[PDB]
């Protein structure tokens, strides 16, 4: 089942609903990464960027990946583990996307790229954890990054920063194991 898996899928749907009623821009003004240093103390923004989606294929594609991989981490390593991966990856993939291309980005695939990174590496270095990423998916993941380099209009810094975060954490966690 997974409480931290469902809470995030419900948050993303609640916020998507609001973007349909109020328009994208109206939600963006309030949930996006701070665009002005004066707003730096609006702490929610460092995380809230991750809840915003721009089409139905955007949310569905993301929530599917979140369910498959997020649910697997939560099931085997617990709710606390998936919380910490989510918070650290959302903050850092946000920070890198803002530097690459400014603050107008949104979506969960920064968290998703860190999950792909964590589940793959953790499954190779600590097979006993009981999670893993299939080879057929580590290829789709890699095609997905590079298809963003050569363009749609993806947040490329989010993708690469997320991936990096998730490898790092999976490495650290495959020492302590």
């Amino acid at each position: 089942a997974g409480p931290v898996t469902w809470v995030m899928m419900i948050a993303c749907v609640v916020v998507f609903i609001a973007m349909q009623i109020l328009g994208d821009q109206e939600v963006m003004l309030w949930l996006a990464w701070p665009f002005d240093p004066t707003l730096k103390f609006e702490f929610w923004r460092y995380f809230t960027h991750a809840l915003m989606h721009f089409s139905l294929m955007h949310i569905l594609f993301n929530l599917l990946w979140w369910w498959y991989l997020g649910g697997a981490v939560e099931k085997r390593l617990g709710s606390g583990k998936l919380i910490v991966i989510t918070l650290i990856s959302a903050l850092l993939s946000g920070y890198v996307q803002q530097k690459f291309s400014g603050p107008w980005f949104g979506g969960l695939s920064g968290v998703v790229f860190a999950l792909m990174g964590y589940v793959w590496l953790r499954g190779e270095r600590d097979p006993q954890s009981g999670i893993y990423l299939q080879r057929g998916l580590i290829i789709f993941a890699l095609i997905w990054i590079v298809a963003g380099w050569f363009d749609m209009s993806m947040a490329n810094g989010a993708h690469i920063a997320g991936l990096a975060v998730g490898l790092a954490m999976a490495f650290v966690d495959s020492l302590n194991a």
Partner: peptide
């Protein structure tokens, strides 16, 4: 705007 993706 850029999608995370």
């Amino acid at each position: 705007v850029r999608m995370a993706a």
